[PDB]
């Protein structure tokens, strides 16, 4: 689900990605039809530029943190960092080093809250390169004739089944994370040339690559399935199966 959403009707999956060059915000939201001069309000009210920045930039930003508040309720952010801040805050008047060591854990929490509340963005260019290499998909779909009908991609809440992914039954990892960092979603596609539609379901998880401490790909498609539907033909393509992928690579278990 898209966390950052304003009252704008167009391009919901790009609202947080697009960086406009406007000095301020437009008077009205993007029109879905031709309106009349009296439908809109000339010379908008005083303090309108500030009101827009609050309802178009601030408010949808706070709705993102509220929508994904379940990913920051870990014992490290809830108890450790606030407690560390209070221990040095009692000595803030003795020296400056206490003021610093009391505010650092708060800036650290905001950074984890900041990165954890963002909409999960996979490398979509890697994905389209993967499906356009399959012959069963290029038979009905092409980039010059494909269009998106729906898009959903959100993290999975809580820990998963402790038999398929025993990695997350680690009390040290659980101390920093309350979620799994995995995401699940789908892609509703259509081809205007062949008239075909397909639902591209996918599951992602972070994996390590080529290095010891750093993550290789935070969103690695370990399950990728396509249910293609045409005029009178229904096909089911399996680009990535989880039974064969989970035997080669395991999740990463982010810390901090």
């Amino acid at each position: 689900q898209m966390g950052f959403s304003s009252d704008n009707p167009y391009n919901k999956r790009w609202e947080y990605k697009w960086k406009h060059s406007y000095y301020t915000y437009p008077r009205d939201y993007e029109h879905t039809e031709v309106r009349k001069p009296q439908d809109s309000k000339d010379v908008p009210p005083i303090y309108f530029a500030y009101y827009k920045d609050f309802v178009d930039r601030w408010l949808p930003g706070m709705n993102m943190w509220w929508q994904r508040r379940h990913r920051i309720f870990d014992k490290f952010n809830v108890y450790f960092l606030p407690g560390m801040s209070l221990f040095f805050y009692q000595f803030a008047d003795l020296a400056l080093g206490f003021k610093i060591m009391a505010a650092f854990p708060l800036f650290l929490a905001y950074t984890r809250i900041r990165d954890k509340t963002l909409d999960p963005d996979f490398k979509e260019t890697y994905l389209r390169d993967m499906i356009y290499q399959n012959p069963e998909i290029t038979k009905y779909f092409n980039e010059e004739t494909i269009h998106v009908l729906d898009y959903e991609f959100e993290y999975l809440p809580g820990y998963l089944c402790p038999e398929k992914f025993p990695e997350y039954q680690n009390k040290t990892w659980q101390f920093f994370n309350t979620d799994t960092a995995q995401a699940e979603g789908f892609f509703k596609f259509g081809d205007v040339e062949s008239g075909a539609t397909m639902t591209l379901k996918f599951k992602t998880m972070p994996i390590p690559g080529k290095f010891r401490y750093q993550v290789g790909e935070p969103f690695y498609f370990y399950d990728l399935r396509a249910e293609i539907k045409c005029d009178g033909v229904y096909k089911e393509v399996v680009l990535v199966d989880e039974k064969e992928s989970l035997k080669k690579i395991r999740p990463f278990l982010f810390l901090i």
């Binding site: 167009y10 391009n11 039809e33 009349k36 010059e144 998106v148 205007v192 008239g195």
Partner: protein, 108 residues
């Protein structure tokens, strides 16, 4: 739901096709109504808009008109692939099927 037409306020009417034959006729009537279209009678279901004096910017004006007549909210990611009459017919069907199965409009 009202719009100005030559200085007069007129109530706008929306259409519901829900039929293949009604779509092919609407798109042709739509493309033939655009002042940039050439060879309006030579236009058929398999006509490339490039062959009738239309470019990428003209497909936008056509899509903008589809939103006016049908009430759809077409995203910017879908417009640049509408380069043939066949494309508008299949896209309109995909939208009618999406609302009939998912009970909601496609992502804008």
């Amino acid at each position: 739901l009202t719009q100005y037409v030559e200085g007069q306020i007129v109530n706008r009417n929306q259409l519901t096709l829900k039929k293949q034959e009604d779509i092919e006729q609407y798109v042709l009537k739509l493309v033939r109504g655009y002042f940039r279209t050439t060879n309006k009678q030579g236009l058929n279901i398999n006509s490339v808009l490039q062959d009738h004096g239309l470019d990428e910017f003209d497909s936008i004006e056509l899509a903008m008109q589809v939103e006016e007549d049908l009430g759809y909210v077409i995203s910017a990611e879908t417009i640049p692939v509408l380069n043939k009459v066949k494309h508008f017919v299949n896209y309109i069907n995909h939208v009618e099927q999406f609302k009939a199965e998912n009970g909601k409009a496609p992502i804008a």
